[PDB]
């Protein structure tokens, strides 16, 4: 970063933002990961057992990424409106 004495780029620009401690305990789950789970019903514990999310994850969200083919019961997870349609299209069920 030394530029010969001129105020370097990372010092003449302002600092911004802050780091959220909740983002470190939140994960995203692809539709293609719903088949890797064991038992069909997916929750925090079953996703951790399947080594899909970290052990310290407290909040998990399923997004429209990949593709789901089997009926899956999502429980206690936030689901995007795009993934909600794809899960219900494969005979799945979403319950809060």
């Amino acid at each position: 970063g030394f530029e010969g004495g001129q105020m370097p780029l990372y010092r003449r620009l302002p600092k911004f933002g802050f780091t959220s401690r909740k983002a470190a305990i939140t994960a995203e789950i692809r539709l293609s990961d719903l088949a890797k789970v064991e038992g069909g019903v997916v929750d925090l514990n079953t996703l951790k057992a399947a080594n899909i999310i970290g052990i310290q994850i407290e909040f998990a969200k399923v997004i429209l990424a990949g593709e789901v083919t089997t009926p899956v019961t999502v429980r206690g997870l936030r689901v995007t409106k795009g993934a909600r349609a794809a899960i219900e299209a494969a005979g799945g069920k979403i319950e809060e």
């Binding site: 970063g1 370097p8 780029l9 990372y10 010092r11 003449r12 620009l13 302002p14 911004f16 933002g17």
Partner: protein, 64 residues
Amino acid sequence: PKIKTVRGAAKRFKKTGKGGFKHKHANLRHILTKKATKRKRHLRPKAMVSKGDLGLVIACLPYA
């Protein structure tokens, strides 16, 4: 030993999707009465690091 991040650079640059870096504009901390509103408005959104400066940023943020 691991490379150490320049912590001052980590608080000013965020890595974007295609590998670029976004940053806040300068000239928007203090005296602002004399600055035209059009000028201050164009400084609010984040900007991308120019091509000539990417070498400096990447060297300072090896784990970004």
